[PDB]
Design a protein around this ligand. Structure first.
Ligand SMILES: *[C@@H]1O[C@H](CO)[C@@H](O[C@@H]2O[C@H](CO)[C@@H](O[C@@H]3O[C@H](CO[C@H]4O[C@H](CO)[C@@H](O)[C@H](O)[C@@H]4O)[C@@H](O)[C@H](O[C@H]4O[C@H](CO)[C@@H](O)[C@H](O)[C@@H]4O)[C@@H]3O)[C@H](O)[C@H]2NC(C)=O)[C@H](O)[C@H]1NC(C)=O
Ligand SMILES: *[C@@H]1O[C@H](CO)[C@@H](O[C@@H]2O[C@H](CO)[C@@H](O[C@@H]3O[C@H](CO[C@H]4O[C@H](CO)[C@@H](O)[C@H](O)[C@@H]4O)[C@@H](O)[C@H](O[C@H]4O[C@H](CO)[C@@H](O)[C@H](O)[C@@H]4O)[C@@H]3O)[C@H](O)[C@H]2NC(C)=O)[C@H](O)[C@H]1NC(C)=O
Ligand SMILES: *[C@@H]1O[C@H](CO)[C@@H](O[C@@H]2O[C@H](CO)[C@@H](O[C@@H]3O[C@H](CO[C@H]4O[C@H](CO)[C@@H](O)[C@H](O[C@H]5O[C@H](CO)[C@@H](O)[C@H](O)[C@@H]5O)[C@@H]4O)[C@@H](O)[C@H](O)[C@@H]3O)[C@H](O)[C@H]2NC(C)=O)[C@H](O)[C@H]1NC(C)=O
Ligand SMILES: *[C@@H]1O[C@H](CO)[C@@H](O[C@@H]2O[C@H](CO)[C@@H](O[C@@H]3O[C@H](CO[C@H]4O[C@H](CO)[C@@H](O)[C@H](O)[C@@H]4O)[C@@H](O)[C@H](O)[C@@H]3O)[C@H](O)[C@H]2NC(C)=O)[C@H](O)[C@H]1NC(C)=O
Ligand SMILES: CCC[C@@H](CCO)Nc1nc(N)nc2c3ccccc3n(Cc3cc(CN[C@@H]4COC[C@H]4O)ccc3OC)c12
Ligand SMILES: CCC[C@@H](CCO)Nc1nc(N)nc2c3ccccc3n(Cc3cc(CN[C@@H]4COC[C@H]4O)ccc3OC)c12
Ligand SMILES: *[C@@H]1O[C@H](CO)[C@@H](O)[C@H](O)[C@H]1NC(C)=O
Ligand SMILES: *[C@@H]1O[C@H](CO)[C@@H](O)[C@H](O)[C@H]1NC(C)=O
Ligand SMILES: *[C@@H]1O[C@H](CO)[C@@H](O)[C@H](O)[C@H]1NC(C)=O
Ligand SMILES: *[C@@H]1O[C@H](CO)[C@@H](O)[C@H](O)[C@H]1NC(C)=O
Ligand SMILES: *[C@@H]1O[C@H](CO)[C@@H](O)[C@H](O)[C@H]1NC(C)=O
Ligand SMILES: *[C@@H]1O[C@H](CO)[C@@H](O)[C@H](O)[C@H]1NC(C)=O
Ligand SMILES: *[C@@H]1O[C@H](CO)[C@@H](O)[C@H](O)[C@H]1NC(C)=O
Ligand SMILES: *[C@@H]1O[C@H](CO)[C@@H](O)[C@H](O)[C@H]1NC(C)=O
Ligand SMILES: *[C@@H]1O[C@H](CO)[C@@H](O)[C@H](O)[C@H]1NC(C)=O
Ligand SMILES: *[C@@H]1O[C@H](CO)[C@@H](O)[C@H](O)[C@H]1NC(C)=O
Ligand SMILES: *[C@@H]1O[C@H](CO)[C@@H](O)[C@H](O)[C@H]1NC(C)=O
Ligand SMILES: *[C@@H]1O[C@H](CO)[C@@H](O)[C@H](O)[C@H]1NC(C)=O
Ligand SMILES: *[C@@H]1O[C@H](CO)[C@@H](O)[C@H](O)[C@H]1NC(C)=O
Ligand SMILES: *[C@@H]1O[C@H](CO)[C@@H](O)[C@H](O)[C@H]1NC(C)=O
Ligand SMILES: *[C@@H]1O[C@H](CO)[C@@H](O)[C@H](O)[C@H]1NC(C)=O
Ligand SMILES: *[C@@H]1O[C@H](CO)[C@@H](O)[C@H](O)[C@H]1NC(C)=O
Ligand SMILES: *[C@@H]1O[C@H](CO)[C@@H](O)[C@H](O)[C@H]1NC(C)=O
Lengths: 748, 741
């Protein structure tokens, strides 16, 4: 097996992963046929022309974040690598562009360094460069020099498609840029003025990022320097006249008050326009520029609020009706009190508008009937408002917003999604969900809802398939709760412990049995320790129950038989999570009453000192058993007699100091065994060896206190004989003794 | 030195604490002059006449919870040679019988939580000096157990017996022939359905009688509950308590009572505490003829007497509650009613000593708060866990039917009148919310789903609040004048109000902290604070303690950001600062140097610090406690005396320190290096040092441990706790043993 790297052939190329292995130098034991080498997050301090000596087929090298506790690179160190195309050298404290880089380079990343001069000696010979990243070298309150770009430095790069110079002090757009450019990033570069000459001849440019130039600095979560008097970026009327192929334009945080419509007259394919963190409330109301954007699919006008103004309504121009290709509209942080039906008339005839994002607007009232008149809304995102009852910075990420999905894909897969989470809908009245479309995914998480659901609250939206009611104070005091949602498949009641933790009040979970199609139920972190009248959970359909963060230590108290069959009635259950239940021991009768249909059982992060392995005989379909983070001291020596279906056995973070002789004899089905972070001093050959067919492909042993005397030789010989079983984190499978090998890996 | 027990002389008697040290047998290395020995929570399986050999002055032995799983076997007359043994605790030992041949000198015997189903003369009649006898919790709930047989006249010879507890046992009848010396008789959950005139005859010295759980109210019981035939009441004869003239405590909780016979208290002039929780007494609370017979009553508990299925508009209390002149506390939880009007509590307003009113868990929606002004001297108004909205396993030595903990935190109640409105729905505090309230000094509004922007006017009608708890809300700190109307505020708790702080796009204002002239304690824990608007610094001339745990100083002290570099410098009087749980991998030197120089206690535990610049302790001449536990520190400075001459406590447990430097000062009393990677302590490293913790280190017990062992013998003044957990990791033949073996 390879060491220190994890070498894998996927598919024509051979990849070597040597990241985060505290390597002081590049290892001279890397496979000769490796093509892509990842040495990021190590303590490597020096690179010479001998560092990559016998690796002639090397096309990619990643030396990011080296050292971790600056990287010294000699001139022409990678010059013998005639096949090197991609070289990542980010966060290396490099003071200059390395001299003598190979002419074969197609991608070069020098992000997060101290490089303040872009010179011809450094990059003019790299005529094959397609992607060049020099972002985040001088920014924020970092002590750094102004970025000098030598005249015509990028001119010879006739194949350059991507150039990123963001988060550097430039002041001006660098002149003499190659016409082959497709993507030009100049975000946070202190460029206050864009003339007609700056983007001249860039007829192939599909993306231009000019965000953070003359930024809007009020309430900035980062060091922010505005232009003189909080002034706007000055973009000439003809600045984008040759940008005929532009698809992406980012003007976020450029302190814009006006959008010149003439900017888009020669830009017929503009698809994505970011105008977040500007002063465009006036332009949103009048919007002459909206008539010039027929192909636009994504428009972001978030956080354009006027400081000190909380208006009653949102003023949307009738020209929003000209955005025929619009798919998503982001209007977060506009800030207004009420959304009326007539306010969104300009968007109601757009055929592909599937997403409307109105989060963080402090909205108190909404006429929900307005969403019905839309052509085909699929995501109505109203999270984080004040709706009451109806009466450090990652350089390869978006700096001004999270690119994550608004709704969970598992919820949105069912159909129309309505997100009303993080609001104040503390009580759902009889007409709360009146006049809403056929909502399939509904999120009412964190609404301070302390009501007793009784089977009538969701009757106007009866086709909800995924319901999220997490982080509320729900009072489960009625057996008919949620039963009106006949087709409900996923129900999340996590973090509704308020009333469950009070013994004196009544608790009713009988409604679970009345669903014919309920598949997933999450009752996590509810502190459930007592139920009224019905002590059992029953369901002919339920497939998964998450019961983590409850009190099975109390429910399965030795002197109490009432909750002994609490899960037996879940006749179709395949996945059960009993983690975080403070279980010191599970009664044998309680374990025997778990559904026999179980394929995955999690009992991790409890306090189990013992586990009766014999009881696995009554679970003929158990594939995954997870007992991590317990206090188990012993393992059974005849697991084959108790199970013939177990594929994954997780036992990490326990107190197992001995692996029984013949532990894996005749098991056959076991593929993954995790014994990491236990107290194993050694592994005897007999504890792993087998006389039957073995499907063991993964064995984890990192974090065990291994005594590296000659007694560890039988295990090392076993490792050499069984290359098919992968032992991950081989550098963390460290010797604890003797002294002369205390920090070394087992392989030595 | 002591091993395995922690022997201490406090004051005339010598105590030995050997609890929870996985002892397989009683240790033969206990001090000869020990008087009280605690061997509870061990794996001891056998007790013989040789177990306590040479411990002649032993007056107390506690062998509770032994064995604590992989029953205690006691030979007949095992403790018979101990001529001074008075107290013997043998709880949770799976004992099938009362041990034979127990010594006649016993004054207290506890056999709680065993399998003893027969109380025989051979077992206890010779124990004529017994004052306290506990035999509770031997047969109860769904435990498989036999009915409790009490031999006739078994307690008769115990002429000095003052306390007898037989609770949580199947008795069916009150045992006859009880000694007249009895003061306290516990018969809770004993299946005694009827009390006749003869049962408590001649018990003229009885001060306490507990008959709770006999014919229990079983609806919504958090434990196995068997009601009497048809949910019937306990049947207590009119003259059952005729001779109980000295009764001070009477517990009739969960006896399914519908009527209280007033004649029960005609010969009971000193009754002080009466528990009537979990009964069916809504009718008796409204009419209450028995209330005229209770002039000396100080505590009355009528909790959880609600009618199932009835949520009335009002609470009906009888005018006879005005006859409870000695009343100090009234508990009316679980009565269940919608609104509390001012005329509803008129019968209590002239009671002089009524300092506590407890109305928790009643589902109250509205209260006329002006009603509490007319009370003589209410000190605790407990309204927690209701539905108040804006103005238009079982421990045997604990109370089974309620928590005996204080209703309010003593630190809050020490300032004066306390009003607890926690766990309610006061999501917004309007202008007249606190109108007509008394001079409230301690206010708790924790967990009220309050998402409002406090602006400096919400608490103007109660301006003398000194301790304010606003924990577990969604408060929007968006106004510099918040809480400034509380000009005498000393303690402010804003823990768990992260809702708006976690959103970068909304504004966050903490400037109000500087405007308080007497603010002493401020808790901003678990607020996820990572960004502030306009003012990046916390300032206060008075603040003494700041709890900033569970925030994001890793983001605030980002290397490329100087805005929060002096975030705490302006807290000029700060002595205690908690920076735990802030995900700090490193603290910039400039940020550490800007911490208040007045600090005496600095906690930076449970972060991810890989390095700590010890040199910077020079700018903290008053630092007494430095807590760096639960970090990833690998190294310690070799010249701590040059950086500090005031440090008394240094906590470094749960780090990755594998070596103690040479010369490891005079001010240091407590050094905690437990749960680190120390293999040995060399002669180079080896004074006010009185405590040194080293448990959980992987000690190589081979050669250099002899030097540390010699140092331990030379310095008996420094205590090393948990000596059984200071275990050898190597070699194999001593892998589980303590280093002192
Ligand atoms: C209350 O309880 C519910 C039920 O458990 C929780 O919801 C589930 O949360 C889990 C964990 O986030 C979800 O599982 C994850 O789904 C991801 C997406 O799956 C898609 O892609 C896979 C292929 O990768 C498709 O087969 C599938 O059909 C999906 O459309 C996966 O990417 C996740 O990773 C898996 O693989 C990786 C290895 O690649 C492993 O490391 C992971 O451990 C895992 O095996 C993962 O499977 C699950 O989908 C959710 N279910 C539902 C119904 O939503 C709630 O989150 C919980 N609530 C709270 C508040 O905690
Ligand atoms: C305003 O009103 C609110 C709401 O009623 C009050 O909040 C309660 O405050 C109390 C006291 O601080 C809280 O009780 C504490 O709970 C902690 C967490 O629970 C533990 O439970 C078990 C043990 O039963 C543990 O195994 C488990 O790991 C949990 O962490 C406890 O840790 C606390 O224990 C304290 O006492 C023990 C000794 O008994 C010590 O060993 C501990 O070190 C510690 O000192 C404690 O029990 C309670 O949870 C709060 N309730 C809610 C709903 O928040 C406010 O106190 C009140 N404010 C004022 C001013 O009165
Ligand atoms: C209904 O609406 C609610 C509310 O909007 C939705 O709830 C959110 O759901 C998402 C997706 O599940 C949650 O995101 C998770 O966040 C986890 C991180 O949480 C913290 O704790 C970690 C340690 O336990 C810690 O590592 C982590 O820090 C790191 O990441 C942070 C960014 O994620 C970063 O700021 C830190 O610097 C650090 O790098 C966290 O602080 C993460 O582990 C999960 O993978 C996941 O991303 C949100 O937290 C939920 N929000 C709330 C308010 O509850 C819900 O999904 C909606 N339901 C549906 C059906 O769509
Ligand atoms: C927010 O931060 C607050 C400030 O730290 C937290 O309040 C503090 O909590 C600590 C820990 O519980 C308390 O300290 C304990 O006090 C008790 C009692 O001390 C007093 O009484 C004893 C006699 O019983 C007496 O000997 C003392 O001298 C005291 O006067 C001690 O027994 C403990 O060992 C420990 O010292 C603080 O008292 C308390 N401060 C205040 C002002 O309340 C608060 O809990 C935090 N909030 C949350 C939600 O976590
Ligand atoms: C993107 C949100 C950014 C900030 C900007 C504030 O410069 N807004 C808000 N930030 C926070 N943290 N909270 C709220 C908030 C809570 C409830 C209802 C509306 C709310 N807004 C909206 C808003 C309100 C005002 C009136 N607030 C005054 C001052 O304090 C007493 C009130 O009387 C003025 C402008 C305004 O947004 C433009 C905010
Ligand atoms: C000590 C509390 C014990 C239980 C007893 C329940 O027999 N009460 C409650 N237990 C919980 N968990 N919640 C609530 C609750 C929430 C809001 C307002 C009042 C509330 N009560 C009070 C109560 C209500 C009814 C009406 N309930 C029906 C059923 O479902 C629809 C409602 O219309 C009848 C009797 C009654 O108390 C006796 C309770
Ligand atoms: C490395 O480069 C140096 C000159 O900088 C040269 O002397 C040496 O021979 C080179 N070695 C290899 C392996 O290329
Ligand atoms: C890089 O190190 C080499 C020696 O390994 C030396 O010749 C060169 O000058 C160093 N450069 C810098 C900037 O340290
Ligand atoms: C330009 O390169 C020279 C030579 O290394 C250096 O002195 C100068 O500082 C560089 N420019 C900037 C702005 O750093
Ligand atoms: C524009 O890009 C194409 C490749 O897509 C290339 O052939 C063409 O020469 C480029 N134009 C200029 C002027 O560089
Ligand atoms: C709405 O926007 C239009 C277009 O700019 C403007 O004329 C009108 O005054 C605005 N009205 C309000 C109340 O904002
Ligand atoms: C609308 O969306 C569909 C599906 O994504 C696409 O094929 C179509 O061309 C789009 N039309 C317009 C007008 O945007
Ligand atoms: C649930 O509430 C409805 C009224 O909303 C009522 O008809 C039903 O009886 C309640 N369930 C119970 C068992 O109280
Ligand atoms: C459960 O389903 C049955 C059959 O459809 C129905 O009769 C019953 O009323 C439902 N229960 C509730 C509480 O709605
Ligand atoms: C049982 O669960 C399976 C999925 O594992 C599902 O296909 C089936 O329909 C469920 N049966 C019932 C009765 O709901
Ligand atoms: C495992 O469970 C069986 C069946 O309840 C029981 O007979 C056996 O003793 C259990 N094993 C242990 C060690 O408790
Ligand atoms: C207690 O153990 C002793 C031997 O140590 C034996 O004589 C006696 O019979 C045992 N009693 C029981 C009940 O096991
Ligand atoms: C009642 O108690 C006193 C001691 O307080 C004792 O002297 C007296 O004899 C006791 N009465 C009876 C009848 O036992
Ligand atoms: C009130 O308390 C005082 C002091 O404890 C006590 O003397 C007085 O008798 C009590 N009042 C009544 C009426 O019991
Ligand atoms: C705080 O709110 C009050 C009104 O409740 C207002 O007078 C004051 O100006 C607010 N503070 C700020 C700075 O907005
Ligand atoms: C504290 O400052 C606020 C904001 O200016 C002010 O409203 C308040 O009156 C000040 N406090 C006092 C005691 O004057
Ligand atoms: C400073 O704190 C002390 C307590 O440590 C207190 O006595 C003093 O009054 C405080 N000073 C001010 C200015 O509040
Ligand atoms: C400790 O802080 C001082 C002052 O900032 C600095 O000079 C010194 O280098 C620091 N020590 C380390 C090891 O960073």
């Amino acid at each position: 097996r390879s060491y220190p790297c994890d070498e894998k052939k996927q598919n024509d190329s051979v990849i070597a992963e040597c990241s985060n292995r505290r390597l002081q130098e590049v290892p001279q034991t890397v496979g000769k046929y490796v093509t892509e080498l990842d040495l990021s997050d190590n303590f490597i301090t020096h690179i010479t022309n001998e560092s990559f000596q016998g690796l002639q087929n090397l096309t990619k090298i990643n030396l990011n974040h080296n050292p971790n506790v600056g990287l010294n690179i000699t001139d022409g160190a990678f010059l013998n690598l005639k096949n090197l195309r991609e070289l990542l050298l980010e966060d290396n404290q490099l003071p200059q562009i390395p001299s003598g880089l190979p002419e074969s380079l197609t991608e070069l990343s020098l992000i997060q360094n101290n490089i303040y001069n872009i010179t011809k000696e450094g990059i003019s010979r790299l005529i094959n460069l397609k992607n060049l990243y020099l972002a985040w070298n001088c920014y924020f309150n970092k002590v750094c020099e102004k970025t000098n770009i030598e005249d015509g430095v990028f001119e010879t790069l006739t194949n350059l498609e991507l150039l990123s110079l963001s988060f550097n002090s430039l002041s001006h757009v660098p002149p003499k840029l190659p016409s082959s450019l497709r993507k030009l990033f100049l975000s946070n570069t202190q460029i206050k003025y864009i003339s007609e000459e700056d983007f001249k001849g860039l007829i192939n440019l599909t993306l231009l990022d000019l965000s953070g130039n003359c930024p809007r600095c009020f309430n900035a979560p980062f060091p922010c320097v505005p232009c003189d008097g909080g002034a706007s970026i000055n973009i000439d009327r003809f600045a984008f006249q040759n940008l005929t192929q532009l698809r992406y334009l980012n003007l976020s945080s450029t302190s814009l008050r006006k959008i010149n419509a003439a900017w888009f007259k020669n830009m017929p394919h503009l698809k994505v326009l970011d105008l977040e963190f500007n002063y465009l409330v006036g332009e949103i109301a009048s919007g002459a520029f909206l008539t010039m954007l027929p192909r636009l699919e994504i428009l972001d006008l978030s956080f354009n609020y006027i400081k000190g103004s909380y208006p009653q309504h949102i003023n949307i121009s009738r020209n929003f009706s000209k955005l025929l290709s619009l798919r998503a509209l982001h209007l977060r942080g506009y800030v207004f009190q009420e959304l009326r039906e007539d306010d969104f008339q300009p968007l109601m005839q757009l055929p592909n508008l599937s997403t409307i994002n109105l989060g963080i607007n402090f909205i108190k009232q909404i006429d929900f009937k307005l969403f019905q008149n839309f052509s085909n809304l699929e995501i109505i995102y109203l999270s984080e408002n004040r709706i009451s009852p109806l009466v450090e910075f990652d350089p390869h990420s978006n700096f001004y917003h999270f690119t994550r999905p608004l709704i969970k894909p598992q919820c949105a897969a069912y159909g129309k999604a309505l997100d009303l989470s993080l609001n104040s809908i503390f009580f759902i009245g009889p007409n709360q969900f009146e006049n809403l479309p056929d909502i399939a995914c509904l999120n009412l998480s964190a609404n301070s809802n302390a009501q007793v659901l009784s089977g009538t609250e969701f009757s106007a939206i009866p086709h909800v398939k995924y319901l999220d009611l997490t982080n509320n104070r729900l009072d489960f005091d009625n057996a008919s709760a949620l039963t009106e949602l006949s087709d409900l498949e996923v129900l999340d009641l996590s973090y509704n412990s308020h009333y469950f933790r009070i013994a004196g009040v009544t608790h009713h979970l009988e409604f679970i049995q009345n669903f014919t199609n309920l598949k997933v139920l999450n009752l996590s972190h509810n502190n459930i320790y007592t139920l009224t009248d019905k002590y059992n959970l029953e369901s002919k359909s339920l497939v998964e129950l998450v019961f983590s963060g409850n009190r099975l230590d109390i429910l399965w108290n030795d002197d109490d038989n009432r909750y002994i069959s609490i899960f037996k009635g879940l006749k179709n259950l395949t996945r059960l999570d009993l983690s975080l239940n403070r279980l010191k021991h599970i009664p044998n009768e309680a374990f025997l009453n778990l559904p026999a249909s179980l394929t995955e059982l999690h009992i991790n992060d409890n306090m189990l000192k013992f586990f009766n392995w014999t009881l696995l005989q009554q679970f003929p379909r158990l594939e995954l058993l997870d007992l991590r983070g317990n206090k188990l001291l012993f393992l059974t020596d005849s697991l084959s007699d108790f199970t013939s279906s177990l594929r994954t056995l997780l036992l990490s973070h326990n107190r197992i100091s001995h692996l029984p002789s013949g532990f894996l004899s005749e098991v056959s089905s076991l593929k993954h065994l995790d014994l990491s972070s236990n107290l194993l001093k050694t592994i005897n050959k007999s504890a792993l060896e087998t006389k039957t067919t073995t499907k063991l492909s993964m064995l984890e042993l990192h974090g065990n206190p291994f005594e590296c005397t000659c007694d560890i030789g039988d295990f090392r010989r076993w490792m050499d004989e069984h290359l098919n079983v992968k032992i991950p984190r081989l550098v963390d499978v460290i010797c604890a003794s003797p002294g002369d090998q205390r920090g070394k890996s087992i392989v030595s």
